[PDB]
């Protein structure tokens with residue numbers, strides 16, 4: 130009943146035609162996975178804010194345990210499950226609808242919680258704090274998050290982020306937050322520029338051309354499309370100042 134309700138409609142439509150809905154690459158997903166040493170055929174893994182599950186399918190192909198993708202948008206989960214079905218993976222890979230502020234898991238159920246380009250929806254620290262209970266002792270969190278690369282920056286890019294997601298922070302500050310939340314910062318690495326360009330903005334042009342033909346003349350859709358363009362423009366102009374960082378973190382008692 131709001132522009133926002135109609136908005137979610139567009140977002141889903143727009144991004145449904147992309148293999149990923151945020152910066153990343155199969156190489157990056159597997160690099161993060163390479164730091165996790167606890168997994169077996171009996172492991173239970175969840176991917177939070179999984180989108181259509183592009184990264185989840187990569188993960189699933191390189192682990193033997195069960196993987197559950199969770200996302201707020203049923204349209205994304207329908208695609209997730211369609212793709213798992215195509216790959217014959219449904220014995221191990223399942224997509225479910227849910228909200229990351231209200232996860233359905235039992236305490237200490239999971240060996241691994243994955244989340245790429247999604248924790249910002251509840252906030253980095255909040256996710257670190259609230260998701261901890263769902264992990265087995267010695268289990269892992271592996272999340273990619275928006276980062277500043279410097280302490281000072283141009284007003285334009287600062288203002289953009291203060292409006293979009295003011296919890297963006299520098300990497301040393303973020304590593305400190307991992308530690309403070311009771312996790313050992315086992316690995317922390319910055320995503321390459323190609324995760325943003327080749328693997329996200331570039332496929333986004335094809336998706337945008339499909340979206341615009343479908344929603345031609347719709348005011349809200351054209352606005353939404355303009356915002357997407359701005360996002361890419363800002364990245365090309367300010368990429369020296371920000372990016373994504375992958376944090377792989379082990380839940381340990383010694384840190385709380």
Ligand SMILES: C[S@@+](CC[C@H](N)C(=O)[O-])C[C@H]1O[C@@H](n2cnc3c(N)ncnc32)[C@H](O)[C@@H]1O
Pocket residue numbers: 148149150151152153177178179180181182183184199200201202205227228229230244245246247250
């Ligand atoms: C930029 S996308 C990335 C999707 C995917 N993880 C990737 O890396 O391609 C953010 C995802 O978070 C989901 N999302 C937003 N708020 C959520 C919430 N409260 N609970 C669960 N998922 C949420 C969106 O629907 C979307 O699929």
